[PDB]
Design a binder for this molecule. Structure first.
Ligand SMILES: [Mg+2]
Ligand SMILES: [Mg+2]
Ligand SMILES: [Mg+2]
Ligand SMILES: [Mg+2]
Ligand SMILES: [Mg+2]
Ligand SMILES: [Mg+2]
Ligand SMILES: [Mg+2]
Ligand SMILES: [Mg+2]
Ligand SMILES: [Mg+2]
Ligand SMILES: [Mg+2]
Ligand SMILES: [Mg+2]
Ligand SMILES: [Mg+2]
Ligand SMILES: [Mg+2]
Ligand SMILES: [Mg+2]
Ligand SMILES: [Mg+2]
Ligand SMILES: [Mg+2]
Ligand SMILES: [Mg+2]
Ligand SMILES: [Mg+2]
Ligand SMILES: [Mg+2]
Lengths: 146, 117, 99, 63
RNA sequence: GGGGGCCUGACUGCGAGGCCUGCAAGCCGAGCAGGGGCGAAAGCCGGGCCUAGUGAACCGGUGGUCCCGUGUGGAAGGGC
RNA sequence: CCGGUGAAAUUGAACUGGCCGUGAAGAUGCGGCCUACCCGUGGCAGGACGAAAAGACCCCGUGGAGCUUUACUGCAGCCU
RNA sequence: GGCGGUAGGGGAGCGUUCCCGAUGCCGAUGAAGGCCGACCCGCGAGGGCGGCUGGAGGUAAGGGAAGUGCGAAUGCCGGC
RNA sequence: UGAGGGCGCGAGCGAUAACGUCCGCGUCCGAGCGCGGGAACAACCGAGACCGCCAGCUAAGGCCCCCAAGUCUGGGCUAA
RNA sequence: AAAAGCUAACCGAGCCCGGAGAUAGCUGGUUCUCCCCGAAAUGACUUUAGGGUCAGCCUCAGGCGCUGACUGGGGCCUGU
RNA sequence: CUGUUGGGAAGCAGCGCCAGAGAGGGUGAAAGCCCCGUAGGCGAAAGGUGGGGGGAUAGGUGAGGGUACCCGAGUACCCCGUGGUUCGUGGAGCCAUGGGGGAAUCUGGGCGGACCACCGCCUAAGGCUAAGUACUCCGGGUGACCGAUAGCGCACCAGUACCGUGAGGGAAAGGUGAAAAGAACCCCGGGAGGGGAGUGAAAUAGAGCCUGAAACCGUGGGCUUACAAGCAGUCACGGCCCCGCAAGGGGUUGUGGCGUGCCUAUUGAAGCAUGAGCCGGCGACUCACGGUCGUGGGCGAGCUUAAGCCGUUGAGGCGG
RNA sequence: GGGGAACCUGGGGAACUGAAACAUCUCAGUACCCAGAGGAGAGGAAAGAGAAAUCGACUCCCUGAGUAGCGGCGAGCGAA
RNA sequence: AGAUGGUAAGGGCCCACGGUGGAUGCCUCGGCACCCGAGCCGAUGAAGGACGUGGCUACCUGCGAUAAGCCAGGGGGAGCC
């Protein structure tokens, strides 16, 4: 293809809205008409009316914070073995991040659904009702400790 | 990339002048006056192009009425016979044969006094 | 996008890898005869790639031939020019990109 | 720039896993001088809503 | 509706399906388990013949709770 | 009246009659009817709801500002 | 079969300024702009054509970026 | 968008006044101040206007003149 | 020497520069063309009544396909 | 280089040349090769710089055992007010402290979010320290930045004229021609201003001298108007003058038909509700970041970078 | 010793505004006043961080991160 | 009896020709921003300014009682005040 004639496809050009005209868009600039319109209508999300919002809900969802804030206990993240059959061997968190899971959430636990290739998976924990689902396969050593 | 007005705003005011030709005083040289009286025209011309028939629709009848009453009968009594004769011809204009040879129309009259009396 | 355009000249044949040069040194005259003995008669435009800063000189003043280092194969200039030329010194990085 | 979440809504609401929004039920720490023991049950359980949840969704969004 | 007896179902854990209705609410409710009251049993009991007699949310007191509790162990505060 | 010099507010545009009705209902401007050669000049002020400073009047604004107080909170100062 | 239409919604287009298209092309045998016209294309906003003036820049087809299209705001500048 | 308005009707207020108001049904103006009758007359009557034509059928309403259409036929009525 | 008078021609708080493009639920303006559809002035809440959130009524795109308005027949509810 | 239009050639045609230089600007119009210059290369007696190299100097260079010496004072620490850290007294630490109480020398002293025990980090109350970082009066390069109402207020004798005592406010205004070659001279006339001749390619480029619109003023010509009631127009016919070929077309209007200016707010207009004397220009939904929906393209259990690092200078690649 | 367009450190330090009123809060230690340091300024060699019997002076960009947290827990504020 | 032109003081409509006025189009010793560089000056008197200075000089510019300027070195080579 030469330099010109490489136009776009279709359904993609901008032609944005130009509401300063005389029969295209209206002489009130689109979504305006009544009044109280030049700056803003406050935030139509959490507010407006001036009644009581809908913040009238109760926030029991506790442990809403202290002072030093969060605390460093490790995030246990699980992983469904459905695609653990994509590979095989002494699979370790070391590469499970390289595959496309965990992502330094760290502390890998295995669980899930499906046939498991008797592939000996080393991790930090295993779901019981899946561990016998592994017991009919191979071997599963545990993490270091805590 | 600035894009001043320039050509655009003038040429338009020249077109309104172009249609405001012969309009009294400021109504043809002052722009936003010429804009106005053009609004009424296109409206005045609209309605009247709907009206020009009713004008002639009326005129024809009087001439017709002028003719029938020169035989001795009214327009109301004239038309019925023609209609009784079932003659979807008479375009109320084409009944202008009162100075376009009359016997052609004078003997349309007697073909009316038939089917009614 | 780098690949697509290269085959576009291959798909039309408008391609050439080179390696031999009567103009391995600096002279615009020491090139246009090379083009004569290769097939570029000033009819249509050309992009050129080489890792030698001498040949560039030998054509940096060529209106229908724009310089290009082996790296920034800008798809602009590729599609810009109506024909393409490149070298192995390119066809190892273009390969190390994809190949 | 960089929209600020609404911690006054985080502490109150939890975003589901089908996009729905669910809050604890209202009316359980004031009116309880003995009224319907029935009521102290369908108010200790979470409930979902309708239109206004999208008014809430947009108050979160990075979370 | 007027009397007498025995009782505490003015229970707990749920709760299908629905009236009204913009939201929040408000309102009725069969069915099951734990345990109990009455009645010989069928059965009834999740307040009063009903429709009014009430207050989102924020903040804080009191009693329990396998909870969280900052390097760790108690503690302080928080959470249900 | 003649010679010389020569502004202003106002102004959408005008070829600007009266009367009796209509009409958000005070019509040169709509309907009907009557009157009226074109154009000035001197003057009078009934109309053009006349020019408004955004009426000197009343009301509104979760406006302003001055003043008052055993309205609220703070401060100087004063006692302690 | 439908096509009156305000707020409002969707779709489609015309014009201006600039960039790729360009070391390209049109331009002294006259460009942009300004006076015309009863010619032609388009329903359109617009694009071409003949004449006059002017005297040096202007840029197609397809893409891109906008300080982008005026009839009013007792809008502002200037002129009358 | 959340000020509506008119008319017919069923109520309340009002004086079985208000071209006054608050409701319900429906209609129309607003958005149909675009056409025809109502002299004039936004919502009373007819009738939804995409454009053109010097073509025909009609509704309301009208047929002596402005004003298009019977001084139409028969039968009564009234002398203001 | 007291009117709230005067403080550089308008003093219930001087003038200038700045915060500064303060704020304004208020007024007014909001610019080119053509096609299709096409409303609302209702209800609830609101220091709420010119404003604002939700439902209602509108437009567009996708997934549904006789259900939809209206009528006829059968049943039921109604207490002017 | 020549030839040919052209007042003028860089244009057009032919024949060539350079190229590490074909980026630009100027020359009577559009030049790679007429001019300055660009590619590339050389360069200062003097001042400065120094950030790269080198010399010198400042400074610095061992361990084991014992000793019972010293390790930064109203300081540490505690309380009463307080500020900073996201900490609005909150469970409220830590850092600094205005007031008050007031230590110790490694058998010591602070900290790890009240407090205590252990465990771990630190050794305060003396000071100094380049680099990496912000800015643009200045210089350079660059621009999908403007082009005389724009761009800062000033392209120009502008922070001027002008206003105000004063701080302070603060404009308007560019364009002959390539060359002044700028009108000798004659005539009207007091001059100004004009006629002619002349220069000039052009004076219809005349010194507010490129283009010259619109409002506004006037002269000439075609149509009309002194029995007529008017948002000033529309429709029809005739009439007058003009263009044109049949036929048709332009401009005007006498008569007849109808005809309640525009915008805005209003339920509501023709309106006695807002606004505009007119004209011409400036003037009003863009941008940044995050996010919901839609769509176009890339990959697809994956998808993707940010700061930054190498390189021509309108090239990209790494960077997980 | 004074000047220097902005940049930098310290001493003081608002209110409009937001909260659709408004006092805690925000705007913000911003704008403004003062003193001073130069081509940069400030900071700068742990009585540090923070959980590993680990990092190692200080500044600067990215991410962490609108996380943890702060809040008439309301607007909204905002680390390491 | 009747019918009918017929004059324009002036106006309106239009075409032509100009006057003011300056938009639009073209040009730019001007500014706007980005990146780099560079970054202080003064008691040896600074930044800024007053007055003067020329053969004649009104303003600008430069300069300073030696005054549109002095001295030495370096660049350059036909004009200059
Ligand atoms: Mg636009
Ligand atoms: Mg519309
Ligand atoms: Mg407003
Ligand atoms: Mg609300
Ligand atoms: Mg499992
Ligand atoms: Mg007819
Ligand atoms: Mg006849
Ligand atoms: Mg009058
Ligand atoms: Mg008061
Ligand atoms: Mg242009
Ligand atoms: Mg009528
Ligand atoms: Mg139809
Ligand atoms: Mg008749
Ligand atoms: Mg006073
Ligand atoms: Mg010739
Ligand atoms: Mg200017
Ligand atoms: Mg000005
Ligand atoms: Mg204008
Ligand atoms: Mg300097």
């Amino acid at each position: 293809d030469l330099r010109p004639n490489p136009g776009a496809n279709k359904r993609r050009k901008r032609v944005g809205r130009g509401p300063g005209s005389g029969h295209g868009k209206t002489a009130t600039r689109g979504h305006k008409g009544q009044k109280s319109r030049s700056g803003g209508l406050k935030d139509p999300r959490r507010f407006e009316g001036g009644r009581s919002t809908t913040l009238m809900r109760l926030p029991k969802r506790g442990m809403q914070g202290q002072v030093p804030g969060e605390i460093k206990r490790p995030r246990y993240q699980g992983v469904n073995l459905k695609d653990l059959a994509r590979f095989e061997g002494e699979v370790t968190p070391e590469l499970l991040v390289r595959a496309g899971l965990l992502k330094k959430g760290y502390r890998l636990k295995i669980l899930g659904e499906g046939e498991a290739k008797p592939l000996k998976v080393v991790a930090h924990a295993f779901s019981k009702s899946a561990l016998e689902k592994l017991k009919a396969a191979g071997g599963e050593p545990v993490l270091l400790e805590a | 990339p600035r894009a001043k007005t320039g050509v655009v705003r003038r040429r338009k005011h020249k077109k309104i002048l172009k249609l405001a030709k012969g309009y009294w005083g400021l109504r043809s040289k002052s722009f936003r006056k010429a804009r106005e009286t053009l609004f009424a025209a296109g409206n005045y011309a609209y309605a009247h192009r709907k009206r020009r028939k009713r004008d002639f629709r009326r005129l024809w009848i009087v001439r017709i009425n002028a003719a029938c009453r020169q035989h001795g009968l009214n327009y109301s009594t004239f038309i019925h016979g023609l209609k009784k004769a079932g003659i979807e011809v008479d375009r109320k204009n084409l009944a202008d044969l009162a100075v376009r040879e009359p016997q052609v129309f004078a003997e349309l009259v007697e073909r009316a006094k038939a089917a009614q009396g | 996008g780098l690949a697509m355009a290269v085959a576009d000249r291959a798909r039309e044949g408008k391609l050439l890898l080179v390696e031999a040069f009567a103009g391995v040194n600096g002279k615009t005259k020491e090139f246009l005869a090379w083009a004569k003995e290769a097939g570029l008669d000033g009819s249509e435009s050309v992009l050129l790639v080489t890792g030698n800063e001498l040949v560039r000189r030998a054509a940096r003043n060529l209106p229908w031939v724009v310089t290009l280092a082996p790296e920034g194969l800008n798809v602009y200039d590729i599609v810009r020019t109506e024909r393409l030329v490149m070298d192995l010194d390119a066809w190892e990085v273009f390969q190390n990109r994809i190949g | 720039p960089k929209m600020k979440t609404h911690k006054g809504a985080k502490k109150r609401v939890k975003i589901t896993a089908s996009g729905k929004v669910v809050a604890m039920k209202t009316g359980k720490r004031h009116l309880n001088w003995q009224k319907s023991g029935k009521e102290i049950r369908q108010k200790g359980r979470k409930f979902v809503l309708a239109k206004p949840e999208a008014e809430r969704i947009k108050l979160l969004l990075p979370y």
